[PDB]
Amino acid sequence: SSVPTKLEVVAATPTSLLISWDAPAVTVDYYVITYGETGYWPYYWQEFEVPGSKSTATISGLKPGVDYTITVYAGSYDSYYYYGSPISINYRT
Amino acid sequence: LNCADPTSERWFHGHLSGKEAEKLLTEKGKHGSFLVRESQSHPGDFVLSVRTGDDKDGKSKVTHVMIRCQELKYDVGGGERFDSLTDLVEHYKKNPMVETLGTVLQLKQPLNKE
């Protein structure tokens, strides 16, 4: 039971990923997309926030032929901490 | 609770989201400016946020570092270990932390809580 669900790379360039997760039945206030190079992950990453009304994002400025780990978090404006059980995937290039 | 308490340090901001941190390091920080804040994914754990770019909206780019406390010592996932975050911070002003995400990670000026 992850929140959100079904994270996948929809489309990719050598330097950019187009990701999507389930626009769900039960909505949240925001999402935080985190990403980093696998092997340095989870100790080094970059991140950005999107509203809960969104279920897609682009991660750009990446390098070709590199393994990346991407984790999406869900959150509430009424909590400092993210919801437990985020969802995570790997993708190279 | 299991490592030296760094909450009295001036570069410690406590509750501060990644978006808030990015705004701070942008509006007042330079390249290599850093702050420590509490993790939002791991309660009680710390995050070192480092400005690593000027540009990417009119916001700057921040790389984030997970701080691990294990067996009374601090590290950033590997390599050297420190009795305090203050010692860790000083070491990574003089030494590079890592090269990742197309940027060389090294500390410069702390961004202090106001």
Side-chain angles (χ1 to χ4, degrees):
Chain A
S1 66
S2 71
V3 182
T5 47
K6 292 189 213 292
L7 177 65
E8 52 182 65
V9 173
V10 177
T13 83
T15 64
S16 160
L17 303 175
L18 177 55
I19 67 170
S20 182
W21 53 99
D22 275 336
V26 183
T27 60
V28 299
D29 284 324
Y30 66 89
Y31 292 101
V32 171
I33 294 88
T34 69
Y35 61 94
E37 301 178 17
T38 303
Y40 289 114
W41 181 267
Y43 288 95
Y44 308 89
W45 73 96
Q46 279 166 16
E47 72 184 55
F48 60 93
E49 182 170 343
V50 309
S53 55
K54 306 266 302 145
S55 75
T56 58
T58 57
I59 301 164
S60 56
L62 304 179
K63 280 145 54 204
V66 178
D67 294 288
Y68 290 94
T69 302
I70 305 107
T71 298
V72 181
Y73 289 95
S76 174
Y77 293 145
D78 299 337
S79 185
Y80 175 75
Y81 305 100
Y82 302 146
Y83 287 115
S85 305
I87 185 164
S88 191
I89 64 173
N90 305 119
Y91 195 92
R92 182 202 287 257
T93 293
Chain B
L1 278 93
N2 50 338
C3 282
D5 164 81
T7 58
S8 306
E9 292 309 285
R10 312 151 111 179
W11 37 253
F12 184 78
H13 294 234
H15 280 202
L16 188 74
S17 71
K19 179 188 178 58
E20 293 184 85
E22 189 133 344
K23 160 143 121 287
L24 270 182
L25 296 167
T26 292
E27 290 178 348
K28 287 197 169 187
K30 309 291 297 183
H31 195 88
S33 286
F34 66 90
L35 52 80
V36 177
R37 55 192 188 95
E38 188 188 355
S39 173
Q40 304 176 260
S41 59
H42 301 92
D45 292 354
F46 299 130
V47 172
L48 173 59
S49 297
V50 187
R51 180 169 171 182
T52 46
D54 267 341
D55 281 352
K56 63 191 199 53
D57 44 25
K59 205 127 291 181
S60 59
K61 200 49 221 166
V62 182
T63 301
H64 298 268
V65 191
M66 165 183 279
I67 296 169
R68 174 180 67 169
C69 166
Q70 214 185 54
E71 308 181 328
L72 298 167
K73 275 168 165 280
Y74 287 108
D75 66 2
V76 287
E80 47 280 274
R81 325 226 302 235
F82 310 92
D83 301 316
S84 69
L85 276 190
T86 295
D87 284 346
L88 181 145
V89 159
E90 289 308 301
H91 174 87
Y92 289 118
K93 289 184 179 178
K94 311 184 205 174
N95 298 97
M97 180 140 31
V98 81
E99 183 168 31
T100 198
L101 306 186
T103 201
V104 218
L105 204 45
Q106 190 160 355
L107 305 181
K108 298 294 179 194
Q109 287 173 337
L111 195 142
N112 297 341
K113 52 182 164 210
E114 303 258 301

Coordinates of all heavy atoms in Angstrom, one line a residue, chain B residues 48-103:
Chain B
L48 N 21.4 17.8 5.2 CA 22.3 18.9 4.9 C 22.0 19.3 3.5 O 22.0 18.6 2.5 CB 23.8 18.4 4.9 CG 24.9 19.4 4.5 CD1 24.9 20.6 5.3 CD2 26.3 18.7 4.6
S49 N 21.5 20.6 3.4 CA 21.1 21.1 2.1 C 22.2 22.1 1.6 O 22.5 23.1 2.2 CB 19.8 21.9 2.2 OG 18.7 20.9 2.5
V50 N 22.7 21.9 0.4 CA 23.8 22.6 -0.2 C 23.5 23.3 -1.5 O 23.0 22.6 -2.4 CB 25.0 21.7 -0.4 CG1 26.2 22.5 -0.8 CG2 25.3 20.9 0.9
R51 N 23.7 24.6 -1.6 CA 23.5 25.2 -2.9 C 24.6 24.9 -3.9 O 25.8 25.0 -3.6 CB 23.4 26.8 -2.7 CG 23.2 27.5 -4.0 CD 22.9 28.9 -3.8 NE 22.9 29.7 -5.1 CZ 22.6 31.0 -5.2 NH1 22.4 31.7 -4.1 NH2 22.7 31.5 -6.4
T52 N 24.2 24.4 -5.0 CA 25.1 23.8 -6.0 C 24.9 24.4 -7.4 O 25.6 24.0 -8.4 CB 24.9 22.3 -6.1 OG1 23.5 22.0 -6.2 CG2 25.5 21.6 -4.9
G53 N 24.1 25.4 -7.5 CA 23.9 26.1 -8.8 C 23.1 27.4 -8.6 O 22.5 27.6 -7.6
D54 N 23.2 28.3 -9.6 CA 22.6 29.6 -9.6 C 21.2 29.6 -10.2 O 20.4 30.5 -9.9 CB 23.4 30.6 -10.3 CG 24.4 31.4 -9.3 OD1 24.2 31.3 -8.1 OD2 25.3 32.0 -9.8
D55 N 20.8 28.6 -11.0 CA 19.8 28.8 -11.9 C 18.5 27.9 -11.9 O 17.4 28.5 -12.0 CB 20.3 28.7 -13.4 CG 21.0 30.0 -13.8 OD1 20.8 31.0 -13.0 OD2 21.6 30.1 -14.8
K56 N 18.6 26.6 -11.7 CA 17.4 25.8 -11.8 C 17.2 24.9 -10.6 O 16.1 24.8 -10.0 CB 17.4 24.9 -13.1 CG 18.6 24.0 -13.2 CD 18.7 23.4 -14.6 CE 19.5 22.1 -14.6 NZ 18.9 21.1 -13.6
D57 N 12.5 28.7 -13.4 CA 12.2 29.7 -12.3 C 13.4 30.4 -11.8 O 14.5 29.9 -12.0 CB 11.4 29.0 -11.2 CG 12.0 27.7 -10.8 OD1 13.2 27.5 -11.0 OD2 11.3 26.8 -10.2
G58 N 13.2 31.5 -11.2 CA 14.3 32.3 -10.7 C 14.9 31.8 -9.4 O 15.4 32.6 -8.5
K59 N 14.8 30.5 -9.2 CA 15.3 29.9 -7.9 C 16.7 29.2 -8.2 O 17.0 29.0 -9.4 CB 14.3 28.8 -7.4 CG 14.4 28.6 -5.9 CD 13.1 28.7 -5.3 CE 12.6 30.2 -5.2 NZ 11.3 30.4 -4.5
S60 N 17.5 28.9 -7.2 CA 18.8 28.3 -7.3 C 18.7 26.8 -7.1 O 17.7 26.3 -6.7 CB 19.8 28.9 -6.3 OG 19.3 28.7 -5.0
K61 N 19.7 26.1 -7.5 CA 19.7 24.6 -7.4 C 20.4 24.1 -6.1 O 21.5 24.5 -5.8 CB 20.3 23.9 -8.6 CG 19.9 22.5 -8.8 CD 18.4 22.3 -8.7 CE 18.0 21.1 -7.8 NZ 16.5 21.2 -7.4
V62 N 19.6 23.2 -5.4 CA 20.1 22.7 -4.1 C 20.2 21.1 -4.2 O 19.3 20.4 -4.7 CB 19.1 23.0 -3.0 CG1 19.6 22.5 -1.7 CG2 18.9 24.5 -2.9
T63 N 21.4 20.6 -3.8 CA 21.6 19.2 -3.6 C 21.4 18.9 -2.1 O 21.9 19.6 -1.3 CB 22.9 18.8 -4.2 OG1 23.0 19.1 -5.5 CG2 23.1 17.3 -4.0
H64 N 20.8 17.8 -1.8 CA 20.5 17.4 -0.4 C 21.3 16.2 0.0 O 21.4 15.2 -0.7 CB 19.0 17.2 -0.2 CG 18.1 18.4 -0.5 ND1 17.8 19.3 0.5 CD2 17.6 18.9 -1.6 CE1 17.0 20.2 0.0 NE2 16.9 20.0 -1.3
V65 N 21.7 16.2 1.3 CA 22.5 15.1 1.8 C 21.9 14.5 3.1 O 21.6 15.2 4.0 CB 24.0 15.6 2.1 CG1 24.9 14.4 2.4 CG2 24.5 16.4 1.0
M66 N 21.7 13.2 3.1 CA 21.2 12.5 4.2 C 22.4 12.3 5.3 O 23.4 11.8 4.9 CB 20.7 11.1 3.9 CG 20.5 10.1 5.0 SD 19.9 8.5 4.6 CE 18.2 8.8 4.4
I67 N 22.1 12.8 6.5 CA 23.1 12.7 7.5 C 22.7 11.4 8.4 O 21.6 11.3 8.9 CB 23.1 13.9 8.4 CG1 23.6 15.1 7.6 CG2 24.0 13.7 9.7 CD1 23.3 16.5 8.4
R68 N 23.7 10.5 8.5 CA 23.5 9.3 9.3 C 24.2 9.3 10.6 O 25.4 9.6 10.7 CB 23.9 8.1 8.5 CG 23.9 6.8 9.3 CD 24.4 5.6 8.5 NE 25.8 5.6 8.2 CZ 26.5 4.6 7.7 NH1 25.9 3.5 7.4 NH2 27.8 4.8 7.4
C69 N 23.4 9.1 11.7 CA 24.0 8.9 13.0 C 24.0 7.4 13.4 O 22.9 6.8 13.4 CB 23.1 9.7 14.1 SG 23.5 9.2 15.8
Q70 N 25.2 6.9 13.5 CA 25.3 5.5 13.9 C 26.5 5.2 14.8 O 27.6 5.5 14.5 CB 25.3 4.6 12.7 CG 24.6 3.3 12.9 CD 24.8 2.3 11.7 OE1 25.9 2.0 11.2 NE2 23.7 1.8 11.1
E71 N 26.1 4.6 16.0 CA 27.1 4.3 17.0 C 27.9 5.6 17.5 O 29.1 5.6 17.4 CB 28.1 3.2 16.5 CG 27.3 2.0 16.0 CD 28.3 0.9 15.5 OE1 29.4 1.2 15.0 OE2 27.9 -0.3 15.6
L72 N 27.1 6.6 17.9 CA 27.5 7.8 18.4 C 28.3 8.7 17.5 O 28.9 9.7 17.9 CB 28.3 7.6 19.7 CG 27.6 6.9 20.9 CD1 28.6 6.5 22.0 CD2 26.6 7.9 21.5
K73 N 28.3 8.3 16.2 CA 29.1 9.1 15.2 C 28.3 9.5 14.0 O 27.3 8.8 13.5 CB 30.3 8.3 14.8 CG 31.5 8.5 15.7 CD 32.7 7.5 15.4 CE 34.0 7.9 16.0 NZ 34.7 9.0 15.2
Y74 N 28.6 10.7 13.4 CA 28.0 11.2 12.2 C 28.7 10.8 10.9 O 30.0 10.9 10.9 CB 27.8 12.7 12.3 CG 26.8 13.2 13.3 CD1 27.1 13.8 14.5 CD2 25.4 13.0 13.0 CE1 26.2 14.2 15.4 CE2 24.4 13.5 13.9 CZ 24.8 14.1 15.1 OH 23.9 14.5 15.9
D75 N 28.0 10.5 9.9 CA 28.6 10.5 8.5 C 27.6 10.8 7.5 O 26.4 10.9 7.8 CB 29.4 9.2 8.2 CG 28.4 8.0 8.1 OD1 27.2 8.1 8.3 OD2 29.0 6.9 7.9
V76 N 28.0 11.0 6.2 CA 27.1 11.2 5.1 C 26.9 10.0 4.2 O 26.9 10.2 3.0 CB 27.5 12.5 4.3 CG1 27.2 13.8 5.1 CG2 29.0 12.4 3.9
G77 N 26.9 8.8 4.8 CA 26.6 7.6 4.1 C 27.8 6.7 3.9 O 27.7 5.5 3.7
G78 N 29.0 7.3 4.1 CA 30.2 6.5 4.0 C 31.4 7.4 4.4 O 31.3 8.5 4.9
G79 N 32.6 6.9 4.0 CA 33.8 7.7 4.3 C 34.0 8.0 5.8 O 33.6 7.3 6.7
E80 N 34.5 9.2 6.0 CA 34.8 9.7 7.4 C 33.7 9.9 8.4 O 32.5 10.2 8.0 CB 35.6 11.0 7.2 CG 34.9 12.1 6.3 CD 35.2 11.8 4.8 OE1 36.3 12.2 4.3 OE2 34.4 11.1 4.2
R81 N 34.0 9.7 9.6 CA 33.0 9.8 10.7 C 33.3 10.8 11.8 O 34.5 11.0 12.1 CB 32.8 8.4 11.3 CG 33.0 7.3 10.4 CD 31.9 6.2 10.5 NE 31.8 5.7 11.9 CZ 31.9 4.4 12.2 NH1 32.0 3.5 11.2 NH2 31.9 4.0 13.4
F82 N 32.3 11.5 12.3 CA 32.6 12.6 13.2 C 31.8 12.5 14.5 O 30.6 12.0 14.5 CB 32.3 13.9 12.5 CG 33.0 14.0 11.2 CD1 32.3 13.6 10.0 CD2 34.3 14.5 11.1 CE1 32.9 13.7 8.8 CE2 34.9 14.6 9.8 CZ 34.2 14.2 8.7
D83 N 32.4 13.0 15.6 CA 31.7 13.0 16.9 C 30.6 14.1 16.9 O 29.7 14.0 17.8 CB 32.8 13.3 18.0 CG 33.9 12.2 18.1 OD1 33.5 11.0 17.9 OD2 35.1 12.6 18.2
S84 N 30.7 15.0 16.0 CA 29.7 16.1 15.9 C 29.5 16.5 14.5 O 30.3 16.3 13.6 CB 30.2 17.3 16.8 OG 31.3 17.9 16.2
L85 N 28.3 17.1 14.3 CA 28.0 17.7 13.0 C 28.9 18.9 12.6 O 29.3 19.1 11.5 CB 26.5 18.2 12.9 CG 25.5 17.1 12.6 CD1 24.1 17.7 12.3 CD2 25.9 16.3 11.3
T86 N 29.3 19.6 13.7 CA 30.2 20.8 13.5 C 31.5 20.3 13.0 O 32.1 21.0 12.1 CB 30.4 21.5 14.9 OG1 29.2 22.1 15.3 CG2 31.4 22.6 14.8
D87 N 32.1 19.2 13.5 CA 33.3 18.6 12.9 C 33.1 18.1 11.5 O 34.0 18.3 10.7 CB 33.7 17.4 13.8 CG 34.3 17.8 15.1 OD1 34.7 19.0 15.2 OD2 34.5 16.9 16.0
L88 N 31.9 17.5 11.2 CA 31.6 17.1 9.9 C 31.6 18.2 8.9 O 32.1 18.2 7.8 CB 30.2 16.3 9.9 CG 29.7 15.8 8.6 CD1 29.0 14.5 8.8 CD2 28.8 16.7 7.9
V89 N 30.9 19.3 9.3 CA 30.8 20.5 8.5 C 32.2 21.1 8.2 O 32.4 21.5 7.0 CB 29.9 21.6 9.2 CG1 30.2 23.0 8.6 CG2 28.4 21.2 9.0
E90 N 33.0 21.2 9.2 CA 34.4 21.8 9.0 C 35.2 20.9 8.0 O 35.9 21.5 7.1 CB 35.1 21.9 10.3 CG 34.6 23.0 11.2 CD 34.5 24.3 10.4 OE1 35.6 24.8 9.9 OE2 33.4 24.9 10.3
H91 N 35.1 19.6 8.1 CA 35.8 18.7 7.3 C 35.4 18.8 5.8 O 36.2 18.7 4.9 CB 35.6 17.2 7.7 CG 36.2 16.2 6.8 ND1 37.5 15.8 6.9 CD2 35.6 15.5 5.8 CE1 37.7 14.9 6.0 NE2 36.6 14.7 5.3
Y92 N 34.1 19.1 5.6 CA 33.6 19.2 4.2 C 33.6 20.6 3.6 O 33.2 20.9 2.5 CB 32.2 18.5 4.1 CG 32.3 17.0 4.2 CD1 31.7 16.4 5.2 CD2 33.0 16.3 3.2 CE1 31.7 15.0 5.3 CE2 33.1 14.9 3.3 CZ 32.4 14.3 4.3 OH 32.5 12.9 4.4
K93 N 34.2 21.5 4.4 CA 34.6 22.8 3.9 C 35.9 22.7 3.2 O 36.2 23.3 2.2 CB 34.7 23.9 5.0 CG 33.3 24.3 5.6 CD 33.6 25.4 6.6 CE 32.3 26.0 7.2 NZ 32.6 27.0 8.3
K94 N 36.8 21.9 3.8 CA 38.1 21.6 3.4 C 38.2 20.5 2.4 O 39.2 20.5 1.6 CB 39.1 21.4 4.6 CG 38.9 22.3 5.7 CD 39.9 22.0 6.8 CE 39.5 22.5 8.2 NZ 40.4 22.0 9.2
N95 N 37.3 19.6 2.4 CA 37.3 18.4 1.5 C 36.0 18.3 0.7 O 34.9 18.7 1.1 CB 37.5 17.1 2.3 CG 38.8 17.1 3.1 OD1 38.9 17.5 4.2 ND2 39.9 16.8 2.3
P96 N 36.1 17.8 -0.5 CA 35.0 17.5 -1.4 C 34.2 16.4 -0.8 O 34.8 15.4 -0.3 CB 35.6 17.1 -2.7 CG 36.9 16.6 -2.4 CD 37.4 17.4 -1.2
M97 N 32.8 16.5 -0.8 CA 32.0 15.5 -0.3 C 31.8 14.4 -1.3 O 32.1 13.2 -1.0 CB 30.6 16.1 0.1 CG 29.6 15.1 0.7 SD 28.7 15.8 2.0 CE 28.7 17.6 1.5
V98 N 31.4 14.7 -2.5 CA 31.1 13.8 -3.6 C 30.9 14.5 -4.9 O 30.7 15.7 -4.9 CB 29.7 13.1 -3.2 CG1 28.5 13.9 -3.6 CG2 29.7 11.8 -3.9
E99 N 31.1 13.8 -6.0 CA 30.7 14.4 -7.3 C 29.5 13.6 -7.8 O 29.6 12.4 -8.1 CB 31.8 14.3 -8.3 CG 31.4 14.9 -9.7 CD 32.6 15.1 -10.6 OE1 33.6 14.4 -10.6 OE2 32.6 16.1 -11.4
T100 N 28.4 14.3 -7.8 CA 27.1 13.7 -8.3 C 26.2 14.7 -8.8 O 26.3 15.9 -8.5 CB 26.5 12.9 -7.1 OG1 25.5 12.0 -7.6 CG2 25.8 13.9 -6.1
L101 N 25.3 14.2 -9.7 CA 24.3 15.1 -10.4 C 25.0 16.3 -11.1 O 24.5 17.4 -11.0 CB 23.3 15.6 -9.4 CG 22.6 14.5 -8.6 CD1 21.4 15.0 -7.7 CD2 22.0 13.4 -9.6
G102 N 26.1 16.0 -11.7 CA 26.9 17.0 -12.5 C 27.3 18.2 -11.7 O 27.4 19.4 -12.2
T103 N 27.7 18.0 -10.4 CA 28.2 19.1 -9.5 C 29.1 18.5 -8.5 O 28.9 17.4 -8.0 CB 27.0 19.9 -8.9 OG1 27.5 21.2 -8.5 CG2 26.4 19.2 -7.7

